[PDB]
Each structure stands twice: as C-alpha cells, then as structure tokens.
Design a protein around this ligand. Structure first.
Ligand SMILES: Cc1ccccc1-c1[nH]c(C)c2c1CCCCC2=O
Length: 130
C-alpha cells in the first residue's frame, strides 16, 4: 500500500487501541505512572527502571514519536512486563494485568494490527536489498 497511508492507518489503530485499554476492566491502574507513595509501594522505582503507562503512550502517539508499528506494541507490552515483574502472580494487580494483556494481544489480531508489523519487517528487508 501507500507508505504514508499505512502510517496514518496504524497510527489510527494505535490511538484506538490505547483508548480501548483505558476503558477495559481494570485498565485504570495502568493509566498513569505509579505514585509510589499514594499506592504505598515505596520500592516501585527501585524495581521498575523502565516505567510505562497508557498516558505516556498517548503522549508519544500525540507527539508522533513512534516510527514503526512494533514500537507501540513494545511500549504496551512493557506495561504488562513491569506489572508481572513487580506484582506476585496471585495478586489482584498481576491477574488484572494478565487479563488486559490477553485482550490487547487479541485486539492486535482482530484489528489487523499485526499485519502492519509484518509489513514493517519486509520493507526493512526490501531496504536491505539496496
Ligand atoms: C492498584 C493501583 C490503583 C491506582 C493507581 C495505580 C495502581 C497500580 N497500578 C500498577 C500497575 C501498580 C499499582 C499499585 C499496586 C502495586 C504496584 C503496581 O504494579
């Protein structure tokens, strides 16, 4: 397809997808960066050195700071990885995090978003062939 047209497309799906995650059940705990004091987890940024939240990703989208479709997924997946790292598997937060992660990955399938990630790869090979 048209290269800039494609970029407009997956940008639209990303902005849609981050919004669905904000409204999904429990998504509000990933909306903002954790305030270690107000959540009384005062060791959070001793454990999590690469913090990420839905609002950070929204700002990147708004600022046009994603060059590839995989870069958006990587940031969302980072939220889920921080969540499972910090919270024990039998905790409310860990369980909530795995529920949103399953939903995010399934939206990637339903929305055709993964085809944009596949496209990104072959273009970079097509560029390697030059
Ligand atoms: C549980 C909660 C409520 C309101 C705002 C943020 C949170 C939250 N969101 C994450 C990803 C958290 C926490 C605090 C509990 C332990 C640390 C954590 O992973």
């Amino acid at each position: 397809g048209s290269p800039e047209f494609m970029n407009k497309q997956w940008y639209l799906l990303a902005n849609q997808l981050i919004l669905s995650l904000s409204k999904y059940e429990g998504g509000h705990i990933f909306e903002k960066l954790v305030d270690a004091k107000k959540q009384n987890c005062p060791d959070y940024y001793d454990v999590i050195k690469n913090p990420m939240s839905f609002s950070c990703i929204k700002t990147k989208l708004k600022k046009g700071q994603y060059a590839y479709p995989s870069e958006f997924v990587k940031d969302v997946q980072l939220i889920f990885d921080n969540c499972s790292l910090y919270n024990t598997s039998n905790s409310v937060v860990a369980i909530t995090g795995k529920n949103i992660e399953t939903y995010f990955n399934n939206q990637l399938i339903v929305m055709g978003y993964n085809n944009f990630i596949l496209k990104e790869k072959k273009i970079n090979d097509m560029l390697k062939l030059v």
